[PDB]
Symmetry: D2
Subunit: 250 residues, 4 copies
């Protein structure tokens, strides 16, 4: 019988490549999404057309609130309800926007940025662990630039630092169950086309390896390795996939 | 005219030692507290006996909620109300208890450990910046053992990692305003009186330097250094004060 | 035709497993060794029996000295001599023994610990890059998951392994324009000497959160294979811990 | 009676500022030097004029060779000869120049960059330890940009990483003797007097805190703090004194 994985924020961009690559490797997958319903549903169709009964969809807001624990439990539950098991969790979903220290409320900024990037990953991790031969693991989408943060993204960066903390703490705490917890830390990948050519190339010119952003597939490759049998002794590790961007001084 | 400082969770233990050492250095202090009313006024009493009108108390719960931003604004506001300025913020209050992955609810556990250790510091930092030959700085109380966490303290540890991220991001963004932002990372300090001499010795003997815990004063000494004119070019630095504990492998 | 790799200290233990796995992946291999000549030739024979003309040995002392640059240069040269190319360098060879701060002279200690763990890796990287000026060129340095929590009395070893982290980063940055990726793999406790005491063996096993045992050489090798592969093409400057959570365990 | 200190590369720039501060705080100093004999002897003279026989010079090449151990031992011996004791060692001397991976020979680059930045510090540490109300400590001059290194400075950068491991390894190992081992990590300080101001400003503009390099004195202030009684629980720590520079992404 095939293993199953939950991928958050999986309707597009990096989460989609991850869900696609896990599916190609043999996984059944739960495509979590928030607002991208059409793309989630359309991906589920694509994957199911390739192999029947291997993909479902689960909508949830991962903003921090008093009902976030039950939503995270719902997400993990979908995977069991559809597939009867849950082997892999990929914490990919993430809010990302500036939150200057000096038009949505600060409460909402904290809830969105800390909820998606950290608290939801923690609650999902609880629900995953609570519901457990096997190769169980969690992969958290972290950030190669966490120690050289973008100006005015303090809550995003707090969120991501907290994700590193969770990766470590859950790796220690869940190792007795044979659940590995690791991370993949992208540099720059999938530049928005909202973005100017000048600004894109300015970012591209900073990357040592190839003067280019990562493709979503390259990020997914790292995730796949971490869940694979070739990573069985690896827990609490964060693999940068940044083309050397973080090594470049100001 | 004396500078003024806010110390969070200043009624006892490390916070009190910070507030005390700041006051001796010539600062007027706002002694924030949550539950320890008696200890807080008893400290302010004592400090005011030495120097008239140089200390006030200020009660605030620093648990995360939709009113937390107003609470943190009010703490900063209290310093200005009493003293007409706010030069120094020390983020010291911290909730601390196990939150296993497998009768506080989890929503409460998230709110208290992530609110106190991270979100409240963010919001106090926002409010501090917003209100501004000065020497303005923030010092965050961090944790030297953040990369080798205690078992079943994932939320606490998430919050302490988030505080590192804030220290860095805020150091960066507030540098243009002359506000330095730094941390002190204690090891083991002030063992609970509750604990048996067995368990105390066990922690003590882990410390390479002298097999003893840090005194409150030793922690305060590092804080005072960071706020002083001797740390004028220092920003985004976190100073361990751990007697070498973080270096000791398992 | 098949790519080629140099693996230093490859006659035995972790380097042997890395050489094996690269070979099974399709690489031709230079098995470098220092004293373990019998094991090296045995290993070359066994790989060549599997695919004729795909393995050579190359003997060298990697202690620091005024001729280490020439020795490191010759190791690279011998992969070009045998196979016409050098696609992968794995810096694995390493001297490991206490050097307390309070038989061998201290100058010998310095030369061996810093030479093998850091300076030979630097010099081999230089030679590798120099000889370069359908290809996936990379270097993998065998680092150490425990470097920020060192063993007591192992200061020169630790200084070496920290230096190697630096080389990994500096070389990643500098060799990126040439398409040469540089990365690390950082074992925890792995492949315990069968010789060492069982009691001591258990002591260390018991410390590892994941499975309560040491890594197998093959587990370390898996991470090298990943980093040299086409699935790691945007990865440079990274060090992958393969430690079962050992570095996360406080005192 | 007064404590004594060995400062390596103390004839000029940051070393000199450290020697002077230490002396101003009450230390007797050994002014080590390599080529700057005029500046070394002249410093010793200015300090002795201030307090009789409180300064001596000591010349030594700290390039790695077969004689470096004896040279390092003779440096410590010079302290005991002059003052009957040696309480503090500051590892400051450092070669710094590019060594591209692609007319000194390479073995001489290795010898100088690794000798001065790591191996001499190690040997000086050994001889210091061997020779031992007491406050004994070592401050190693590290580098805040070690993880974002300058292009083509691999040997320097290796040397400075190595110096981090020494700081850690030696802290752990010498704690039982009450010898603390810490470091200070400048960003950019004391730009070359010969570098064009227009080049100098390219670096200054990178610094968040004040768009300025550190003064020699600002770096020395951190050293003074680490050697003081205010830092008696601090070992294994590296204090950045970098104005934010290492937080700035490419
Ligand atoms: N792109 C990069 O260069 C880069 C760099 C560093 C780190 N990373 C990390 O790698 C991961 C993927 O990056 P990405 O650029 O592909 O991410 P992204 O597209 O910015 O976000 C991925 C998904 O997160 C989901 N999301 C956002 N807010 C949410 C909420 N409140 N509740 C639930 N889901 C929410 C969205 O789902 P819907 O579309 O369904 O609304 C979105 O599609 C992220 O964790 C990111 O932080 C990426
Ligand atoms: N002690 C150590 O060994 C150690 C180790 C590593 C890091 N640290 C860090 O250094 C700092 C000081 O440590 P400590 O042991 O002195 O701290 P603590 O005694 O555990 O906590 C300090 C204060 O935080 C306040 N606090 C707790 N929950 C709160 C809430 N929901 N709202 C507002 N305030 C709240 C409490 O105030 P009231 O009493 O007024 O209720 C308490 O007096 C902390 O930030 C800590 O994490 C300490
Ligand atoms: N085993 C672990 O738990 C562990 C933990 C952390 C890191 N690592 C790292 O992983 C790598 C491999 O580990 P390992 O245990 O397999 O290594 P090892 O057995 O200690 O050493 C591997 C080989 O290094 C070679 N070597 C030693 N001194 C040399 C010299 N002066 N010149 C040339 N070669 C020399 C030896 O070759 P000959 O036999 O031919 O003399 C030896 O077989 C090392 O870089 C190590 O630091 C291992
Ligand atoms: N300046 C910065 O911005 C910066 C940045 C990061 C780190 N740091 C570190 O902070 C420390 C002081 O920096 P700095 O700029 O003041 O250093 P520096 O001027 O570059 O060099 C300090 C002294 O090192 C001595 N030295 C050089 N080669 C030597 C050798 N082969 N043997 C013995 N001594 C030798 C020289 O002594 P003589 O003049 O007597 O020959 C020189 O005056 C250094 O460790 C440096 O790496 C500085
Ligand atoms: C120039 O185009 C981009 C800029 C930023 C992101 C991005 C990052 C990110 C953070 C720090 C950093 F140094 C580089 C990237 N984290 C992100 N997290 C999420 N959920 N979405 C993103 N789109 C990003 C993606 C593309
Ligand atoms: C053995 O007696 C103690 C045990 C823990 C703490 C403590 C820590 C802490 C965290 C990790 C670690 F390795 C050592 C200490 N963080 C803390 N944070 C707060 N707000 N209060 C505390 N009381 C502690 C204080 C004394
Ligand atoms: C309990 O039996 C072992 C003890 C040490 C090693 C070892 C390490 C190592 C260093 C620090 C640490 F925390 C764990 C392992 N580095 C090594 N490096 C080399 N070149 N060979 C080795 N044999 C080792 C292997 C097995
Ligand atoms: C802009 O003018 C300067 C450039 C370099 C240095 C310098 C550094 C350094 C290293 C990395 C980095 F990102 C910045 C500085 N390390 C040094 N080490 C020594 N022994 N001397 C120095 N003179 C420096 C000083 C001034």
């Amino acid at each position: 019988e095939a293993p199953a994985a939950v991928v958050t924020g999986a309707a597009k961009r990096i989460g989609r490549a991850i869900a696609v690559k896990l599916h190609q490797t043999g996984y059944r997958v739960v495509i979590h999404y928030h607002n991208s319903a059409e793309a989630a549903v359309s991906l589920a169709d694509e994957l199911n057309k390739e192999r029947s009964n291997t993909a479902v969809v689960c909508q949830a807001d991962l903003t921090n609130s008093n009902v976030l624990p039950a939503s995270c439990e719902e997400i993990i539950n979908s995977c069991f309800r559809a597939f009867g098991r849950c082997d892999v969790l990929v914490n990919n979903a993430s809010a990302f926007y500036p939150t200057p220290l000096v038009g949505k409320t600060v409460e909402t900024q904290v809830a969105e940025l800390i909820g998606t990037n950290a608290i939801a990953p923690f609650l999902l991790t609880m629900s995953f662990a609570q519901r457990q031969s096997s190769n169980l693991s969690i992969v958290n989408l972290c950030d190669a630039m966490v120690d050289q943060p973008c100006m005015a993204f303090s809550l995003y960066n707090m969120g991501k630092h907290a994700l590193v903390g969770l990766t470590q703490s859950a790796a220690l705490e869940l190792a007795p169950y044979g659940i590995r917890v690791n991370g993949v830390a992208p540099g720059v990948s999938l530049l928005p086309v909202a973005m100017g050519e000048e600004e894109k190339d300015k970012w591209r010119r900073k990357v040592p390896l190839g003067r280019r952003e990562a493709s979503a597939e390259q990020i997914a490759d790292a995730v796949i390795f971490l869940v694979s049998g070739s990573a069985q002794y690896i827990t609490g590790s964060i693999i940068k996939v940044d083309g050397g961007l973080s090594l470049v001084h100001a």
